[PDB]
Amino acid sequence: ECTWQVKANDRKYHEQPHFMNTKFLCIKESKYANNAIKTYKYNAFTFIPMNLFEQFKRAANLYFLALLILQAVPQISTLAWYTTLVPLLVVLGVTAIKDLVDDVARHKMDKEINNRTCEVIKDGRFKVAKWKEIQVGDVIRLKKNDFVPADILLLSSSEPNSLCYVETAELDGETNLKFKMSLEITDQYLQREDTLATFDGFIECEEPNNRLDKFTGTLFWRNTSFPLDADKILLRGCVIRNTDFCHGLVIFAGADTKIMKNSGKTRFKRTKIDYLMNYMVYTIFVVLILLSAGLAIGHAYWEAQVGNSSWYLYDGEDDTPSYRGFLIFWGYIIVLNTMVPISLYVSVEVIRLGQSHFINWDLQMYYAEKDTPAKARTTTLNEQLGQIHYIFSDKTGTLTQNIMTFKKCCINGQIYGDHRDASQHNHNKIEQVDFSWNTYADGKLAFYDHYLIEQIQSGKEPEVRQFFFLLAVCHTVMVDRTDGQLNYQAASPDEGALVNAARNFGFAFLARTQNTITISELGTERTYNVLAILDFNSDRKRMSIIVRTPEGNIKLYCKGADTVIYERLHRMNPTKQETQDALDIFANETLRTLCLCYKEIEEKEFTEWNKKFMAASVASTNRDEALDKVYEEIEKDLILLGATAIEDKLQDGVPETISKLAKADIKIWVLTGDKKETAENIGFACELLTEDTTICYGEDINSLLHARMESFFPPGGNRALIITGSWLNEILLEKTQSKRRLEAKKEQRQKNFVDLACECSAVICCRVTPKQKAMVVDLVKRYKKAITLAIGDGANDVNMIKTAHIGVGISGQEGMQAVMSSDYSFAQFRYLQRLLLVHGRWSYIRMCKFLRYFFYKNFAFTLVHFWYSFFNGYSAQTAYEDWFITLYNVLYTSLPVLLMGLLDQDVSDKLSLRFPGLYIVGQRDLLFNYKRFFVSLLHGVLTSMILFFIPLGAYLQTVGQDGEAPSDYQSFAVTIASALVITVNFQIGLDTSYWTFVNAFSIFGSIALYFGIMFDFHSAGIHVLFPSAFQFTGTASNALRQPYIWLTIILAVAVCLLPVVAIRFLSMTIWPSESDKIQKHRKR
Amino acid sequence: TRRPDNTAFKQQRLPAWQPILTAGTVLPIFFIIGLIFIPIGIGIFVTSNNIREIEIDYTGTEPSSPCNKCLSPDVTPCFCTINFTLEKSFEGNVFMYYGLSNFYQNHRRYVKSRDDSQLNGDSSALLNPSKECEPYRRNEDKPIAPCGAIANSMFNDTLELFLIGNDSYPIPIALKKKGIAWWTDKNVKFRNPPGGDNLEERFKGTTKPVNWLKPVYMLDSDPDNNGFINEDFIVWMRTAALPTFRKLYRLIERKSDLHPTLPAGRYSLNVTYNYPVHYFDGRKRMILSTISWMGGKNPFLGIAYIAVGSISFLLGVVLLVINHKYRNSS
């Protein structure tokens, strides 16, 4: 509240003094969001600088930029034409087209978002208006089942009192209808089309605090301007029902109503393995710096001793030797650049981009009915799926499925049973016992118990008649016979099931217009009147009512609970215990229950208490607390009738999914804004918790932790936790001469909180705010730093579906909010069991194995130059052909890496699901870490030692028998190039463990192609019109002829390739891995 | 959206094959290798020790050396002579050829000092080479056609050998001077500039190399071996790979039927000393020996193969016993 003058009526009128955003450029725009919804990432004209700025956080890309700016210099270059451009451009361009294609959808999505076609008074009258027209502070005429433009007040409507309905299941998940009131004074003044057009009294209110609970401020209209609230204010996504048309003023509008100001703030998401890649690139960078420095020192000393001391090595410069040393210290930085190659950051892209398609081509993930694809969204985080620790879920919709389906109750204590539970209809199968006498049968439910249809249609006892009459009249639905049938304009989606069951169980319910109700006794019309409407109370958990028969009979009905009616009930019930003993049967299953009764008062106390009660009915404030006492005065001697049980169909396979994911040592927490009873019901209905679970609600945990401040609970595990948003906040405690100890006061209570929470095996949080959800997410993400996946249902959770390390959105339903803000998506819940067991660990092992071999195959390729430096006088002369040094990690050894990345699978997926104990390695990092990397390094370096020092010792003695193709330079390279190309391919052959025809095809193609081009490089048939690049013609076509050039390649291969076989076999036998244990006796 | 297509590839059920890698499979490879290296190793080591080799160290760096007298004879081409002796005569054909040491023929600033196009016989690169032979591209604005440090410094020395008779008659040895090259290089690698057989007027302006005391076209009267085809010229072109190396210099031919190619006794090596290595320890020498139907003299391969085979065999049994100990035990 800072004198906004929001101006809820006029169009622009721009009364705004010097208070707009005072920046330094004319791009200044309104303080009040008019209609703009700019949820883009950037603009399409100055995309480049922002994209590239956030692109060069890849240290490897900094490195490659340095290589280009370093190599093209016409001083020391030592390499061929600057042709790193071809792979350099790919890594920075294809990712760009990737996020262009994954971001451009926002344009169209918001365009269709910002068009609604409502009626709004932009001039004189309301007019057709797309959503992007309605400015800040206007007047909207909404229609039946509309789609709320802005969060506005309401001035009039169609209903009496201009009351309205909003289905608040958009900022939350439960779908009970919430009604609202309009402005009290103007309930009679304008209420119409025209006179509002002339209006004044423009109001201001408070800038949002994302609280949804205060809404202060007062009117600016005349006649003793009065305060502002939330009961006359509307929200964004609320859908409309039974409220044909309305009228109000717009206070908050644009893309900053409340939710755009509590939900959002995307971030660039990077997987865990990426951080390790960056660290290790830093380490290899510094290592090659030291190598180049030491070698340049060597070169300078050798030149001083021998450089000017020769004559055949005459240069055109008298540059001092130390200048040569400096001038060669930048000559190895370019022949040792194959450390940290460019090939890594291209092949990574193919790996990830391929694996995504495997995510979203899975038939077993393809839903049947809805025809939904289960498609990925990001196509870059595909390996995080193997390192999860905590899953955060929203009960609304995700676990349940918005269906109630009344199950059964008892009569005089006898249960209804399941399949037959009667004499007749017993030798047939379990098939339905036909309901046919019901004129409006249309049963969306099918029962199999039959004594409950024979006693109905026959009439053996009016106890059931009492039950069903109560189940009908004690409703709150707006029954109305509009179109042939009788319409049930529902209010609370709880009684609906029983009401419809009674409706099609003969007892069709009829009109209840004002005070008089009507109902069909087996179709026969009857009429009553309500003696007193006695509503529900949250504490009371009951709603009573009384009807009078036309001839002068009245009843009572409770519609209550057990621990609320088993105290005030009749004292002369023997059947109370049979009903109770059925009820406590109902506890070993997982559906909620209510208790139903009546009291026999006709006239002796009806009027006597009635006069006092009606006198107390009118009240300034004693209508809910003192009127309650006289209200509850007659609430004794409840002569009981029976009970009722309501189920809640939720999903499929969910208990099995929860079991499996518990096996894999994952912690699963449920966060939602729904109330406590539903939370407790789901606690058992999904088997997160059973007997032997000391729940110890928020009060208890607060008290005990305050006392204790092992893991600070009575040891024994299995302590599920139930928490209110208020009590969550209370325990978190966040509602000149600077000391600021509050954070010191906090930030341990948080640590103790999270430790308690982990030491409880489950956590349920009811009545929580969308801000609170992501808040606890990144709380627990800070302490005990882990990996988090958030699976969502709707719009309230979009704040936390975008904070965790991974976000998954359920699709195929109404879902369109998460499905655009997700990172993965699919159309069930049990499908999760395959995402993290078949795809997660497969992806993790594929990527780790690839990334671990891809450094060995480069180290064991580049260190040969370093070892050779000693015998060319530190001169930066390569040890390879130059039509080979460039094609090595392009064409020779590139395919098998990719095929093993994109095809290899540890064990068959089916038994992988059958054994969810394999997953743990991903969490514990038993495949990649800061140690296995150095092992790859130390295994490549030894291979270089061998590769160089075998042909060396071969070439210090004669090799030429009769053709005289002895040692020279152009042979000391071929006889080592061949050894290098053979060793690495044999190694990848050893690592892979899922052979296919295409794998072996690729490997043997690699070897065969290298030798084929070894020959065909030595034919001038292609050296024509190419006369200055294929120098190494006729070198190996001679060299390979003799035997001594062989019988050393085999020696090197053997000596460097057996010890890895020895280590593999040894460590396999002595310390088998889980996959080994499964695989050996895998038929068993 | 519609259902995904069906493909065993897309569903990852393609036919496969798992690793039958077992304690039973592993060991036979170790042991079959352990007995496949020793036979070849000894079979080649015997031949290695069955070759007779002799160096001479033509350099003679000490003052007592018989050739020190021509260390700095900057007056005339020293026609020096040394005596030596061999103990047992040879058979077959023999090769005689020189060798250097501490001569970094693989240096970077040096291996990149050739001009392949002009060597090939190109008309153009002839009258205008490529700017890479930096000190000497236009000494006085003329082509230097065999241009480059590699070609500049082809070492100049003439050797001859005699066998002394019973009346102090050192008769000459009939040594051949052809075929000692790659058959490829004398055919395609680089040829003379085209035209008729003169080699004189087709080298206009192509001045001699600075350190070449004489221009190429009188290198050898033989029509083939003059120009860019003088086979020794090529042999020096093919750069070696280390600071120590032998280049083929001349061959011999096995005499008619059976008698010693070179019966034992004293021999006289008379050589013109013309080349300055005495500054970088370049102890230049010549050697000479035979070649069998198996190979040269290379003990290192024999010893390496023997050691590797024995070690592989040795480790195999340890693997056997350890897997025996740890099978179905703990």
Ligand SMILES: CCCCCCCCCCCCCCCCCC(=O)OC[C@H](COP(=O)(O)OC[C@H](N)C(=O)O)OC(=O)CCCCCCCCCCCCCCCCC
């Ligand atoms: C039965 C069904 C099976 C179906 C399977 C189908 C799978 C086939 C996919 C084939 C994709 C092939 C793409 C390229 C192949 C690999 C590329 C590659 O490996 O480049 C690696 C090399 C990197 O060399 P370096 O040593 O690090 O560089 C050192 C030095 N500085 C230098 O200058 O060297 O890079 C280079 O040295 C130069 C690059 C050479 C060529 C690279 C081209 C990359 C372009 C890829 C774009 C295509 C992607 C399009 C996807 C669709 C987009 C809509």
